[PDB]
Design an enzyme around this catalytic site. Sequence first.
Site, short mmCIF file in Angstrom:
data_model
loop_
_atom_site.label_atom_id
_atom_site.label_comp_id
_atom_site.label_asym_id
_atom_site.label_seq_id
_atom_site.Cartn_x
_atom_site.Cartn_y
_atom_site.Cartn_z
N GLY A 1 0.81 -1.21 0.00
CA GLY A 1 0.00 0.00 0.00
C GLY A 1 0.85 1.26 0.00
O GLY A 1 2.06 1.20 0.19
N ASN B 1 4.20 -2.06 8.95
CA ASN B 1 3.46 -3.31 8.91
C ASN B 1 3.71 -4.24 10.09
O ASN B 1 2.80 -4.89 10.58
CB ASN B 1 3.83 -4.11 7.65
N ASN C 1 3.02 -10.77 3.92
CA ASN C 1 1.75 -10.06 4.01
C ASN C 1 1.27 -9.54 2.66
O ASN C 1 1.87 -8.62 2.10
CB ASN C 1 1.87 -8.90 5.00
N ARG D 1 -0.27 8.53 8.07
CA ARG D 1 0.01 7.70 6.91
C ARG D 1 0.02 8.54 5.64
O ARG D 1 0.74 8.22 4.69
CB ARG D 1 -1.01 6.56 6.81
N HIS E 1 -8.03 -6.68 6.12
CA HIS E 1 -6.74 -6.91 5.49
C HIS E 1 -5.55 -6.62 6.43
O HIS E 1 -4.40 -6.75 6.02
CB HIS E 1 -6.65 -6.05 4.23
#
Lengths: 271, 271
Positions: A33, A41, A100, A172, A250
């Site tokens: 992403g 992560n 992942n 983010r 997710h």
Amino acid sequence: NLEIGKSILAAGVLTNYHDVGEGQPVILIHGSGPGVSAYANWRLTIPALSKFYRVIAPDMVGFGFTDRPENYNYSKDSWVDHIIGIMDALEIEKAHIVGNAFGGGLAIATALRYSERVDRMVLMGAAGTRFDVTEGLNAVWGYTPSIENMRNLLDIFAYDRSLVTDELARLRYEASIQPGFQESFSSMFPEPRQRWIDALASSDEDIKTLPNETLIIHGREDQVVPLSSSLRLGELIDRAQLHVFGRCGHWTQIEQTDRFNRLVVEFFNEA
Amino acid sequence: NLEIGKSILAAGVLTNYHDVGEGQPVILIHGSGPGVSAYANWRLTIPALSKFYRVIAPDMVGFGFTDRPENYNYSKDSWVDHIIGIMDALEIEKAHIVGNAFGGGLAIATALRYSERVDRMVLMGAAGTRFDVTEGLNAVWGYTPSIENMRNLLDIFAYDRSLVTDELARLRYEASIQPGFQESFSSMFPEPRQRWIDALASSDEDIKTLPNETLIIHGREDQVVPLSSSLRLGELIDRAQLHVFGRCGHWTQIEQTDRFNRLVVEFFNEA
């Protein structure tokens, strides 16, 4: 910036990575992403696993704080080369791998090309099989910077939207606009995006040959990679276990942290 | 005979049961094959769980060494009444329940009629949803005594047939011909057997109302109850987790014993 860790030359690329713990090596491979990094992560996973294993979490080339080589040719094979380069650089002859999503596809590909270098595998909401592009994935890969766009992506990843705060979206968003980040990201998975799901996938035939003990993890409500994809992986990989978390998207390692960490540690402990 | 344990009057029926351990109560409910009993199904589970919980494993009326009342009316509701009767007799106000196949259907039914008496649930290759009768199940319920017929049933339950020895088939055959055993068994699930799968099932609507944290376990290769049934249960129960074991049949607690015990204990530990 805690996302910046140690630096090492791997496969010819200056690589940012984290290395915590001692003992059996475990490589953690992050997702794809915008603004993603190994620390982002795995910050809640490394502390738990590092108590029993040596945990290595690198930023894959094109992501995080690893160098972004000019005119670099990104591909499933090049990313696998990077993973092996990281292992070679650290004298890691054989290791378990936790992949992942995007990283799960790379884990499968690494185990197929370098079977002798991979022990056990954990595949989370993993790429690896051909599944029809979802609106969630198209939104993630089609991200353009804005706090609202990041908030939407975070909502797509989460089951419990209450976890998506203005501060998180803001942080983010800031990570996504760091020098060169959006530039490499936007050119990474251009439309039509089905091409990249297919490119990251491994054939049914090849996956069936995997001899590795494998633990497949998926969130029932995953909006990015459909549960059906992991169901398929579970039917293809012989020594596979599938664990599906209800009320989970997710972000399995973040939304079901304690359960996830326990499952993974005991899975590796078996070895 | 280690299958014979303690005796207690429950719901008006003299009941054979095992009671090991101290602390939070956990009720283990066995399956419905010929010669089945609480000990036969749970001998490898009780030792592990009893170290942290009080484990109660009764022979359901019509099975094992519990009394087989003359003209008894066997039904999903009567079996639930038996479970509650056992809990009442032991002053067990609320308990976790682990239901194996037939027992899983009863667990779901008990949680629906007596929600206040049930905490967490573990459903293994569980009945509970309507699925098309399998040849494996028709063979199990249609069993007639013989060492060869028992060997075939054991093969149907197992993934690794090497575990099915002549001695095991012989011992279970002997268990199946004990006084009154085959008589009550053969009249329990007469043809057409789809009727009994349907009778043991709970409606989608009712299952959706279950508020219990639930752990659904299934063997990928289960020949008796299809994996698809547990996939359905996982989509219906809100707080559900699904764990599927590859290289495992209808004997999840026996063929994946250590993994099973660890999963169950940690699941209950969460409470």
